Coordinates of C-alpha atoms in Angstrom, one line a residue:
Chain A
X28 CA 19.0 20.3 -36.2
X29 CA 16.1 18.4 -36.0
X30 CA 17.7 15.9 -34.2
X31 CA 13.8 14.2 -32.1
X32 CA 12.9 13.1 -35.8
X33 CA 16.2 11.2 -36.2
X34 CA 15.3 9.4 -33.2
X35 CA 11.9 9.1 -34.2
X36 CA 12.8 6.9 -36.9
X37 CA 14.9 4.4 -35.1
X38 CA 11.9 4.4 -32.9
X39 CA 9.3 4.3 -36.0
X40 CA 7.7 7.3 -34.2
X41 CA 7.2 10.8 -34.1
X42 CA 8.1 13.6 -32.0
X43 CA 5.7 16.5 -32.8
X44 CA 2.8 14.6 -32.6
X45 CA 2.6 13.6 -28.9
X46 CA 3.1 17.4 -27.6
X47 CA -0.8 18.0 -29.1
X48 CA -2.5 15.7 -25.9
X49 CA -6.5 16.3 -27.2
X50 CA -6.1 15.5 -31.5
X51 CA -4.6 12.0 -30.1
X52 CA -7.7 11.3 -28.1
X53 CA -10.5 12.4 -30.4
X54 CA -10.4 9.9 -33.1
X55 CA -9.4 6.8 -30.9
X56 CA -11.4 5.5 -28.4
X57 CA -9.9 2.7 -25.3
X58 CA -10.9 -0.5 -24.8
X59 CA -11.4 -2.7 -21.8
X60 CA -10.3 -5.6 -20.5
X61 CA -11.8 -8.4 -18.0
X62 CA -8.7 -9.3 -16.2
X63 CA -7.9 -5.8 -15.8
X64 CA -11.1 -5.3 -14.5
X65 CA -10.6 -7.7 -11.7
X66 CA -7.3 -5.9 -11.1
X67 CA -8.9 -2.4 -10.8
X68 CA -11.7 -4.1 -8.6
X69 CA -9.3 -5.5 -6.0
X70 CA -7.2 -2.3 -5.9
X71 CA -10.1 -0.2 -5.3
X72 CA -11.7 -2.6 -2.9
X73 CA -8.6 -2.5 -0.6
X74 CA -9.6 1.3 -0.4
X75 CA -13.2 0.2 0.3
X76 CA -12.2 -1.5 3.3
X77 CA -9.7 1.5 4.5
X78 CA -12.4 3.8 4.0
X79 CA -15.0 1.6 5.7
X80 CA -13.0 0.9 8.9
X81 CA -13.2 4.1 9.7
X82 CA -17.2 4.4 9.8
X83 CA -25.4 0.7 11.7
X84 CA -25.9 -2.0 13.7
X85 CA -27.8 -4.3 10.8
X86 CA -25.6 -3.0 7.8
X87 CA -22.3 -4.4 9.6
X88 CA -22.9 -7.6 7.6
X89 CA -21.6 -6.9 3.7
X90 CA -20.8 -8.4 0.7
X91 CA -18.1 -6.8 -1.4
X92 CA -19.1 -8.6 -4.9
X93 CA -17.8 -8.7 -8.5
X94 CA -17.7 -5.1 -9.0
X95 CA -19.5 -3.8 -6.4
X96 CA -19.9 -3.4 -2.5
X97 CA -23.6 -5.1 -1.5
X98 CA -25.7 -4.4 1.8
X99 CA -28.8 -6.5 2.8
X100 CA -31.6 -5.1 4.8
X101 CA -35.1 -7.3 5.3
X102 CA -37.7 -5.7 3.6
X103 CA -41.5 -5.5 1.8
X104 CA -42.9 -5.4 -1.4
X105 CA -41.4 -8.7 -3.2
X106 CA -37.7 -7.8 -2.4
X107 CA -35.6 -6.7 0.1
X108 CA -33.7 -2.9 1.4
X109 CA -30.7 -3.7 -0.9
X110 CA -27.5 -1.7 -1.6
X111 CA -24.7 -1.7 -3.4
X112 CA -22.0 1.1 -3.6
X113 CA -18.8 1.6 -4.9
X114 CA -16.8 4.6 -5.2
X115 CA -16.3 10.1 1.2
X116 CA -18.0 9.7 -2.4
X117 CA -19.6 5.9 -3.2
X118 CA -21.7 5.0 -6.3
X119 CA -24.5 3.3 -5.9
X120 CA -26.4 0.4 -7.5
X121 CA -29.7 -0.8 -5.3
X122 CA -31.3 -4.1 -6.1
X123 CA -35.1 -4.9 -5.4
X124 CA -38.7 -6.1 -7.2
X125 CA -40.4 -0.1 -10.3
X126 CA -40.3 3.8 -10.8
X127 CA -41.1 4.7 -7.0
X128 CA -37.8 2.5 -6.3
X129 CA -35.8 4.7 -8.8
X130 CA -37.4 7.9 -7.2
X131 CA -35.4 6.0 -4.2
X132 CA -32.7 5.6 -5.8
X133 CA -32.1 9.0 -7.2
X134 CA -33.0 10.4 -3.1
X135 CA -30.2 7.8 -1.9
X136 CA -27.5 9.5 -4.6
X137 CA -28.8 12.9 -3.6
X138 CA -28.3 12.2 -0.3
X139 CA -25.2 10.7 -1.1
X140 CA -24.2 11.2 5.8
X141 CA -23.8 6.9 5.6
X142 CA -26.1 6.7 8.7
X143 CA -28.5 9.2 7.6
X144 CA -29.3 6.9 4.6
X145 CA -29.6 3.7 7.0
X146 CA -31.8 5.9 8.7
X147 CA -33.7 7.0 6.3
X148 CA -34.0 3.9 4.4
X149 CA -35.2 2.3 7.6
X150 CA -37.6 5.0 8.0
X151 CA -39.5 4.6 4.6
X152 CA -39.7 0.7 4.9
X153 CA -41.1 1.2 8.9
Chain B
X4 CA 2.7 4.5 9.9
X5 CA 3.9 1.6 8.9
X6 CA 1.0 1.1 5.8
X7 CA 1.1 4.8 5.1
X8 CA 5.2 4.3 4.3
X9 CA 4.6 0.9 2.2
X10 CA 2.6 2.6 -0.6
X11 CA 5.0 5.4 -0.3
X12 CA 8.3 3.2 -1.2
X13 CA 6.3 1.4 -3.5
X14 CA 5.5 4.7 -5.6
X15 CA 8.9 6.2 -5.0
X16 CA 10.0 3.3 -7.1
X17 CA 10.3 3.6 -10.6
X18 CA 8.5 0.2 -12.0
X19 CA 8.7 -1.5 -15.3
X20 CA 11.6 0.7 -16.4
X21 CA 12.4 -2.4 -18.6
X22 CA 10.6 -0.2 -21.1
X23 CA 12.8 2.9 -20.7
X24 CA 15.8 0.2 -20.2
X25 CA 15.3 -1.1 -24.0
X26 CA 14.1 2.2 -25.5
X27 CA 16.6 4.5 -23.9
X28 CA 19.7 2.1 -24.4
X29 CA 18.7 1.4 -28.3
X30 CA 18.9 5.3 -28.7
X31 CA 22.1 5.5 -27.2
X32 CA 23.5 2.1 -29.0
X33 CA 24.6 4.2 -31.5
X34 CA 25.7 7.7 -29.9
X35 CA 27.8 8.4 -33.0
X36 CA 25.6 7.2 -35.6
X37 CA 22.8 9.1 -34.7
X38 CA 24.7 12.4 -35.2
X39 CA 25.8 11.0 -38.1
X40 CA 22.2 10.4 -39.5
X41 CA 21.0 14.1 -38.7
X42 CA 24.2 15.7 -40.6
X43 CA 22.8 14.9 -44.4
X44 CA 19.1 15.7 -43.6
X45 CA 19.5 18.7 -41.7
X46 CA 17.4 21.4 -42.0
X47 CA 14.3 19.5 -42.5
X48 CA 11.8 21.6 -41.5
X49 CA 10.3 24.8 -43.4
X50 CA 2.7 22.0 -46.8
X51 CA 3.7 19.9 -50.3
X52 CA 1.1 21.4 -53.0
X53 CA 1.4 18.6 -55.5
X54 CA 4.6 20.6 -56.9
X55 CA 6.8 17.5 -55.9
X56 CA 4.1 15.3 -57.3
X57 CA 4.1 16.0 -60.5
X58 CA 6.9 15.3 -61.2
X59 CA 6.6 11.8 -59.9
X60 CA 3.2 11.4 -61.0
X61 CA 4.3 12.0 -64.6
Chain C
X18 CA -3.4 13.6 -58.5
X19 CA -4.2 9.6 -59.0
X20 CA -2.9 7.6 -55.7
X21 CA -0.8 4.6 -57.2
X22 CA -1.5 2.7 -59.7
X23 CA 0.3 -0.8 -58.4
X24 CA -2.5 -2.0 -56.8
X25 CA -2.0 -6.0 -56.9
X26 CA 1.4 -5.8 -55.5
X27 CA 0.5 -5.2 -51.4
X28 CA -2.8 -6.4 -52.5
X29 CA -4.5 -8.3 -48.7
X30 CA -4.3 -11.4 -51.1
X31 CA -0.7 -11.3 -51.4
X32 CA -0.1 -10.4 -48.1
X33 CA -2.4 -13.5 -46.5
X34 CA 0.3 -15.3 -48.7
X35 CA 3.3 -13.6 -47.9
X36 CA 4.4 -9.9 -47.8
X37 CA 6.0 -8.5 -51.0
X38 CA 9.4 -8.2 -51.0
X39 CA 10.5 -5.2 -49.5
X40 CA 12.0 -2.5 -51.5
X41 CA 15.9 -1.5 -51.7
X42 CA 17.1 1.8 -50.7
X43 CA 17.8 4.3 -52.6
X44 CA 38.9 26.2 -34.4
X45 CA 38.7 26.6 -38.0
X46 CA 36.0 28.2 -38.2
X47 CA 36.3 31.0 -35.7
X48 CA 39.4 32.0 -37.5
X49 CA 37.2 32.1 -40.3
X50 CA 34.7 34.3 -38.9
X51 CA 37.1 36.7 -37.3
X52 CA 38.0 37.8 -40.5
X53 CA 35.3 37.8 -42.6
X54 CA 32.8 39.3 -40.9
X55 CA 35.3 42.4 -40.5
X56 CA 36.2 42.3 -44.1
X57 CA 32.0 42.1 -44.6
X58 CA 32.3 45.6 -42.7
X59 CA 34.5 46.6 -45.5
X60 CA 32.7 46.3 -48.2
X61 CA 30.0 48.2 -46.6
X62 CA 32.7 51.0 -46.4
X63 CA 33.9 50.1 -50.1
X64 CA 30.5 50.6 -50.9
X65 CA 29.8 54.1 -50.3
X66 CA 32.9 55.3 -51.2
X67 CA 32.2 53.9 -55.1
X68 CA 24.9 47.7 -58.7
X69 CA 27.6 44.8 -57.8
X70 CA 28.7 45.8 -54.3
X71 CA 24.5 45.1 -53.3
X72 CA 25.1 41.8 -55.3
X73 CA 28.4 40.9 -53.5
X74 CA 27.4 41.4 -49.7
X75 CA 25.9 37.4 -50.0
X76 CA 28.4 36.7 -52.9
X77 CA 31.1 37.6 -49.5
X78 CA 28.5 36.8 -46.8
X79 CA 27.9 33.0 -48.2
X80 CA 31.5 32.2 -46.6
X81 CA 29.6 32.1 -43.3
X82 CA 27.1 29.5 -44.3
X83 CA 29.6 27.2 -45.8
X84 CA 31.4 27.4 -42.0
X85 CA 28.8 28.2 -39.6
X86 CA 27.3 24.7 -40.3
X87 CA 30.2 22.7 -40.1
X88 CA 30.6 23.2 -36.6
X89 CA 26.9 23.6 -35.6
X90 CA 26.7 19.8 -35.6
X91 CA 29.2 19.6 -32.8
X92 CA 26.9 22.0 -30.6
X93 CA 24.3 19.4 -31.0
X94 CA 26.8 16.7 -30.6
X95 CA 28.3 18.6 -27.0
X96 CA 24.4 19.2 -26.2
X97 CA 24.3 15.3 -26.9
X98 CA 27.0 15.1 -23.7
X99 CA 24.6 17.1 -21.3
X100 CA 21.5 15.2 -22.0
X101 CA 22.9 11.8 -21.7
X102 CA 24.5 12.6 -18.6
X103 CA 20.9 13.7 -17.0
X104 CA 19.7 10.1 -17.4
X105 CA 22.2 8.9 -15.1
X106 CA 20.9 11.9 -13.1
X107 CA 17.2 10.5 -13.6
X108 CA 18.3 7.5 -12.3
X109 CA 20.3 8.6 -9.2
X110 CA 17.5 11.1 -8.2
X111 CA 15.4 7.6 -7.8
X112 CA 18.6 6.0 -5.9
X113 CA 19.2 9.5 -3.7
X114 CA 15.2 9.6 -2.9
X115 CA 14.8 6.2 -1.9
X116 CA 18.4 6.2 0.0
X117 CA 17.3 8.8 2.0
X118 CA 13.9 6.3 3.2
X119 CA 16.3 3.5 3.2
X120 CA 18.0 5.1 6.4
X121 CA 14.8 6.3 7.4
X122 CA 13.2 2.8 6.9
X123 CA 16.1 1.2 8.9
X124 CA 15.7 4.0 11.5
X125 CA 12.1 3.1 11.4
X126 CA 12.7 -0.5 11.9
X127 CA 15.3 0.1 14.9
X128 CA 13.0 2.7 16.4
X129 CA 9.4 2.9 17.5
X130 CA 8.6 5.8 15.2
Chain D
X25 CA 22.5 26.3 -26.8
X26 CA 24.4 29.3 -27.3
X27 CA 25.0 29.1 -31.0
X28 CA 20.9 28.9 -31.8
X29 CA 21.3 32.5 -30.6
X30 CA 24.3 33.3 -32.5
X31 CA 21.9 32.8 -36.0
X32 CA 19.2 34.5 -34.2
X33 CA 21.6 37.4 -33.6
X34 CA 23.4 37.0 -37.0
X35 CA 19.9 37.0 -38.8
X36 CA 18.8 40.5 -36.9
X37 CA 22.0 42.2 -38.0
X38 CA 21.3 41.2 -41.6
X39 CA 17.5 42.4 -41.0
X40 CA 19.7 45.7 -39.2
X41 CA 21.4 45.9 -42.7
X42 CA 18.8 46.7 -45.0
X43 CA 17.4 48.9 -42.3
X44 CA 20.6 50.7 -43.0
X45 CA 20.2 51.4 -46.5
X46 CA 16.9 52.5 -46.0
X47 CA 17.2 55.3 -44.0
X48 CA 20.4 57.3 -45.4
X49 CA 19.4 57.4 -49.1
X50 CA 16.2 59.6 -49.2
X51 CA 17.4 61.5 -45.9
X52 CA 20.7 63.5 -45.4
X53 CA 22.4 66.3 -44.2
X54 CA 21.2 69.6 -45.5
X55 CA 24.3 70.8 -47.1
X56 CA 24.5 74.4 -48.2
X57 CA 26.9 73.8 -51.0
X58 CA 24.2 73.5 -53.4
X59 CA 21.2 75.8 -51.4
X60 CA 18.9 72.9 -52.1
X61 CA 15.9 73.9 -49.5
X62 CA 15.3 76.9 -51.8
X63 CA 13.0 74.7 -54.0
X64 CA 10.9 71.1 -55.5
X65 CA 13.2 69.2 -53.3
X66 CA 12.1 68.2 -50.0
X67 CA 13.6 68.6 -46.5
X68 CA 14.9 66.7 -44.0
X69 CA 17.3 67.6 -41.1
X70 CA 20.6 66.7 -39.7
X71 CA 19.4 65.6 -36.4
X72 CA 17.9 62.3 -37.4
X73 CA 20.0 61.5 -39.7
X74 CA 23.1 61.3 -37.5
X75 CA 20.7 59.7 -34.9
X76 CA 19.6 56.5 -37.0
X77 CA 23.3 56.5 -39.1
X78 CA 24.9 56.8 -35.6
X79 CA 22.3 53.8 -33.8
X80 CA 23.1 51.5 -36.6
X81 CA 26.3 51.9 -36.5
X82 CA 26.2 50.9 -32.8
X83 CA 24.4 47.8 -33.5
X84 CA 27.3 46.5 -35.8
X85 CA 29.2 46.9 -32.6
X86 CA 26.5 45.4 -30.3
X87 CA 26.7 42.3 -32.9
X88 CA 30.2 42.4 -33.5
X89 CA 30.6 41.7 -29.3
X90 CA 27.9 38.7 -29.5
X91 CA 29.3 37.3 -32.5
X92 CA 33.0 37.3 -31.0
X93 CA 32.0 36.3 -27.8
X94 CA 29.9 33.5 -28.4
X95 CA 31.8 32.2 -31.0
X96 CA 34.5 31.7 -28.2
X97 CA 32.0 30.0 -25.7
X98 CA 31.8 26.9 -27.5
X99 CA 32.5 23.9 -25.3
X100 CA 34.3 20.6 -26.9
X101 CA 36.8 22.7 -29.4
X102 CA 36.8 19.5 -31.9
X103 CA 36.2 18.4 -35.8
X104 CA 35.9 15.3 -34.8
X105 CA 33.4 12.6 -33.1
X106 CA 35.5 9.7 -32.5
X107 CA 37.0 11.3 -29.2
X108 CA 33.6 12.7 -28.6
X109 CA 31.7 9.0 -29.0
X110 CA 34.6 7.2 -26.7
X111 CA 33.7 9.7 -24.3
X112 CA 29.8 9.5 -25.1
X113 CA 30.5 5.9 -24.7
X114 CA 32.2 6.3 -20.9
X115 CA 28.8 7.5 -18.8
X116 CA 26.5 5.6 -20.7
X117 CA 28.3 2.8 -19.3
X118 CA 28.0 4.5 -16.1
X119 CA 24.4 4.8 -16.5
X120 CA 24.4 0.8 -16.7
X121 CA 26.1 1.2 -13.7
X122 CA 23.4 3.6 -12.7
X123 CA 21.0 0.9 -14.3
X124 CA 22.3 -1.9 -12.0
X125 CA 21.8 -0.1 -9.1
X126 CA 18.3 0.8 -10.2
X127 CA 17.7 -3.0 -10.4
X128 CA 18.8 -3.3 -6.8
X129 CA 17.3 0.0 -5.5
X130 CA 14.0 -1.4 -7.1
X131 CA 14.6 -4.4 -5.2
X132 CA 15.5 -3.1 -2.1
X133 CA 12.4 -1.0 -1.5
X134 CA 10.5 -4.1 -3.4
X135 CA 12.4 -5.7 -0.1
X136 CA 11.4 -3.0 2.2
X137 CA 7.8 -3.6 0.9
X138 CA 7.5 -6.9 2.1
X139 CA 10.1 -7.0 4.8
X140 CA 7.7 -4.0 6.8
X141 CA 4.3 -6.0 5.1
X142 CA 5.3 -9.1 6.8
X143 CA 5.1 -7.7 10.3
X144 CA 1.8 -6.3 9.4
X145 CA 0.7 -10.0 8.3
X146 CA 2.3 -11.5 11.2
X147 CA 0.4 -8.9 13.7
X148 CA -2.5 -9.5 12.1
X149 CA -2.2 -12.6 12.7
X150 CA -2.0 -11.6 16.7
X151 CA -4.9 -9.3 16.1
X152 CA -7.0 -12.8 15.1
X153 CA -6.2 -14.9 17.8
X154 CA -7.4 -13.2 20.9
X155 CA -10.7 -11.9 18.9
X156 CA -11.0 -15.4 17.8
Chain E
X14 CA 12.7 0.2 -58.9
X15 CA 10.4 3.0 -60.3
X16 CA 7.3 1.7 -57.5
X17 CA 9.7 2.8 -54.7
X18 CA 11.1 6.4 -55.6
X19 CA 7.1 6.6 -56.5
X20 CA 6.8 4.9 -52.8
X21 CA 8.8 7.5 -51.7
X22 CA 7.4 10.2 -52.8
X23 CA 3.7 9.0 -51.7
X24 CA 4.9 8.9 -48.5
X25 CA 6.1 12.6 -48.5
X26 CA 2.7 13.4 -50.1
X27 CA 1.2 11.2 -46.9
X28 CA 2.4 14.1 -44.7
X29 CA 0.1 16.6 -46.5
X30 CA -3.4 16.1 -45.1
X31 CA -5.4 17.8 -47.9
X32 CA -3.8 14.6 -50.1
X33 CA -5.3 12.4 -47.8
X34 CA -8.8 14.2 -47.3
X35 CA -8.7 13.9 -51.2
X36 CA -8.2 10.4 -51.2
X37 CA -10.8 9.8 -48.7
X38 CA -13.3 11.5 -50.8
X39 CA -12.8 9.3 -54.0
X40 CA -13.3 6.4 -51.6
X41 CA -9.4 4.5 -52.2
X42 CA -9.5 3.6 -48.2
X43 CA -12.6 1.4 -48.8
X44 CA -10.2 -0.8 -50.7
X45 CA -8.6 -3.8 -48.5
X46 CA -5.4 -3.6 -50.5
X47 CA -4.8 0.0 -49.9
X48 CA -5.3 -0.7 -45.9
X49 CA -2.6 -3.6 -47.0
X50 CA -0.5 -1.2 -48.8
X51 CA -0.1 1.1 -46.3
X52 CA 1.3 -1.6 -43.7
X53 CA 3.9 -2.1 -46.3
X54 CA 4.5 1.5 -46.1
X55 CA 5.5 1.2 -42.1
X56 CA 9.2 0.2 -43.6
X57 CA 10.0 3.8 -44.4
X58 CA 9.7 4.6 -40.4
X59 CA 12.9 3.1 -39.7
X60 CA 16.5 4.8 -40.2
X61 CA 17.5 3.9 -43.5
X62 CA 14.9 4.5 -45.6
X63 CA 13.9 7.8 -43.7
X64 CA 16.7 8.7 -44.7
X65 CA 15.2 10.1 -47.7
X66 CA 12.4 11.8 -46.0
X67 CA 13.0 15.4 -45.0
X68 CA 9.6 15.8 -43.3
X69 CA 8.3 14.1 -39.8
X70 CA 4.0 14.2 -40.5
X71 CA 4.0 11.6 -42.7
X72 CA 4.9 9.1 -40.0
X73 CA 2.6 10.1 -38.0
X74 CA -0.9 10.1 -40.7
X75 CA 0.6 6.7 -41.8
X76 CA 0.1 5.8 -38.0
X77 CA -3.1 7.6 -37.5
X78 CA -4.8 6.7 -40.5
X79 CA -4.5 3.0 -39.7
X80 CA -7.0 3.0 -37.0
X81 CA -10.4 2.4 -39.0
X82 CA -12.1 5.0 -37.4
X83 CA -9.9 8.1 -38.6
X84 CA -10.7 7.1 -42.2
X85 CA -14.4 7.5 -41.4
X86 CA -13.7 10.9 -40.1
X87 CA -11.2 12.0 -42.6
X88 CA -14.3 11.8 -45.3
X89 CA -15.5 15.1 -43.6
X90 CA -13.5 18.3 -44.7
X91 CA -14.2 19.5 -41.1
X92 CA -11.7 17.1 -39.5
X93 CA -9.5 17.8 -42.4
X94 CA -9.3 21.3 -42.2
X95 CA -8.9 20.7 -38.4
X96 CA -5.5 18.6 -38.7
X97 CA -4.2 21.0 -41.7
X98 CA -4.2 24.1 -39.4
X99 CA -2.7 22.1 -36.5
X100 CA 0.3 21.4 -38.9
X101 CA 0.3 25.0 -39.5
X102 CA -0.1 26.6 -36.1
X103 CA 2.6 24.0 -34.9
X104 CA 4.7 25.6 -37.2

């Protein structure tokens, strides 16, 4: 018998459609949403901290903002030795004043071992 | 220990299974109209190249 | 092949006014099979011995379709009774996993571990 | 469950039975009633004749067990579904049951989630008051 | 009453995606009341008028066809050969 179909109907469904998992993904792509987004920050931020605790005398000051950790050091050149990073693997966004601070950027990623970076970033602006 | 075992019990829950309440339930009820559904459109299983259509097309 | 040709029935217009109306619809047998499939044998005996005989092996063998299927539902109907009995298993399994931290929890609570 | 392999079987008997008649119509024993081999004709021993008559043969028998046997191994001897849907009915009312414990076993480690969180809030609340 | 058995039978020809490709070709899905046909068309997914349906895919292309982005991508025979031999190899 083909008795999945005759519950597919009651269910205004089908059966031999959801055992194919990459035809169902191809067409369709997923949407967002902002309150979700909030959600998914808090969750992961509580895993921020976790991860944190367990590791920088200057960074221990931090922001965790709207999507994103942020770290403040003093610096030169019309902005300061900023970092963000969420994700040990983070991700990081750095805010300052253009291509030599991208070359930065990429090094910090590549290096991307916390200390090493506060080291290193301290190094460049000394 | 005692954070390690809270996301543990919460996971070992099942969550929401309002869902499977309602969808599970409805297929059940009913169990004897469901077999009686499937008896009178058995076989159902073997393309449709526009032989069937035809004739309704006509 | 042309699609349809009622095209201002479902029209959007119609439907930002109101849907169309929608349309109206349109035991036994093992006693069976323990002697027909022997008297199936005979023909293939009856056969050689004597066209029509290649004709009535289906002409004796549809019997078996006519029976077969009658009771084929109630396999699928007793295979409904050890399905539906699982999702009380599904649901115990949850009750039995979490019973056994439940203790453990309580032992945990009494105890410094 | 076991009569899906009862057609299966049934099917590869009838496949078996044209097999049959394929095999002991241009072949056969070599009788010397009629000195045959002594011209046109062509040849073709005993040996596997018998053989392939004899193996087909056997797997009428072979079938014959599976067909008897499996026809016997079918559970719930009825023709009828209203004692099978009173019956379907009982455990799906025990799976309420099951459901309404669900309810409660989702609340009780819901319970234990906050019942074991509220010490860790409330020595937290000791770890901020020395520090403090 | 002659619509619906016609109804019916569209829907069985809905399972068949060479129909659809077909249809994409000549451009009938650029139409807003075919869009708003084919919602009416969600009525055969329930028990009673399934009843007459012997085949499961046209549920199924009914439901996938009603995100706008699979009728862009059923205008390409590509994508329509892709889903034809998925029916196929699935059976």
């Amino acid at each position: 018998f083909a008795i999945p179909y005759a519950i597919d109907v009651l269910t205004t469904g089908s059966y031999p459609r959801l055992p194919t998992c990459i035809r169902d993904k191809i067409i369709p792509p997923d949407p967002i949403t902002k309150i979700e987004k909030q959600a998914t920050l808090h969750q992961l931020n509580q895993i921020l901290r976790h991860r944190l605790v367990t590791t920088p005398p200057q960074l221990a000051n931090l922001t965790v903002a709207n999507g994103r950790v942020k770290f403040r050091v003093e610096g030169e050149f019309e902005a300061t030795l900023t970092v963000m990073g969420d994700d040990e693997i983070l991700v990081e966004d750095k805010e300052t004043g253009s291509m030599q601070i991208s070359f930065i950027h990429q090094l910090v990623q590549s290096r991307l071992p916390l200390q090493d970076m506060y080291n290193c970033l301290h190094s460049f602006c000394l | 220990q005692l954070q390690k075992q809270l996301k543990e019990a919460e996971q070992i829950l099942a969550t929401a299974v309002y869902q499977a309440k309602e969808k599970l339930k409805s297929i059940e009820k009913s169990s004897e109209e469901i077999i009686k559904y499937a008896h009178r459109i058995s076989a159902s299983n073997a393309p449709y190249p526009t032989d069937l259509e035809m004739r309704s097309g006509l | 092949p042309p699609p349809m040709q009622y095209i201002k029935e479902y029209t959007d217009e119609n439907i930002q006014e109101g849907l169309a109306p929608k349309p109206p619809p349109p035991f036994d047998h093992k006693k069976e099979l323990r002697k027909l499939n022997m008297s199936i044998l005979i023909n293939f005996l009856d056969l050689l011995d004597i066209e029509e005989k290649l004709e009535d092996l289906k002409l004796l063998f549809v019997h078996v379709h006519h029976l077969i299927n009658e009771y084929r539902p109630h396999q699928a109907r007793e295979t409904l009774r050890v399905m539906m009995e699982v999702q009380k298993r599904q649901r115990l399994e949850t009750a039995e996993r979490f019973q056994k931290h439940l203790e453990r929890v309580i032992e945990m609570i009494q105890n410094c571990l | 469950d076991r009569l899906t392999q009862l057609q299966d079987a049934v099917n590869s008997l009838a496949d078996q039975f044209c097999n049959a008649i394929g095999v002991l119509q241009q072949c056969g024993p070599p009788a010397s009633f009629n000195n045959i081999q002594t011209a046109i004709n062509k040849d073709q021993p005993a040996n596997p004749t018998e053989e392939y008559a004899q193996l087909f043969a056997a797997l009428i028998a072979r079938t014959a067990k599976d067909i008897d046997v499996l026809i016997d191994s079918l559970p719930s001897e009825e023709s009828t579904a209203a004692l099978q849907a009173a019956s379907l009915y009982k455990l799906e009312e025990e799976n309420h049951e099951a459901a309404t414990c669900l309810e409660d076993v989702v609340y009780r480690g819901d319970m234990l989630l906050e019942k074991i969180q509220s010490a860790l809030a409330d020595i937290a609340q000791s770890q901020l008051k020395t520090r403090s | 009453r002659l619509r619906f058995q016609l109804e019916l039978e569209f829907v069985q020809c809905l399972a068949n995606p060479n129909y659809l490709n077909f249809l994409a070709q000549r451009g009938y899905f650029k139409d807003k009341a075919f869009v708003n046909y084919l919602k009416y068309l969600l009525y055969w997914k329930d028990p009673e008028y399934a009843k007459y349906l012997k085949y499961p895919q046209c549920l199924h292309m009914l439901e996938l066809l009603q995100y706008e982005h699979f009728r862009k991508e059923l205008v390409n025979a590509q994508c329509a050969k892709f889903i034809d031999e998925q029916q196929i190899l699935h059976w």
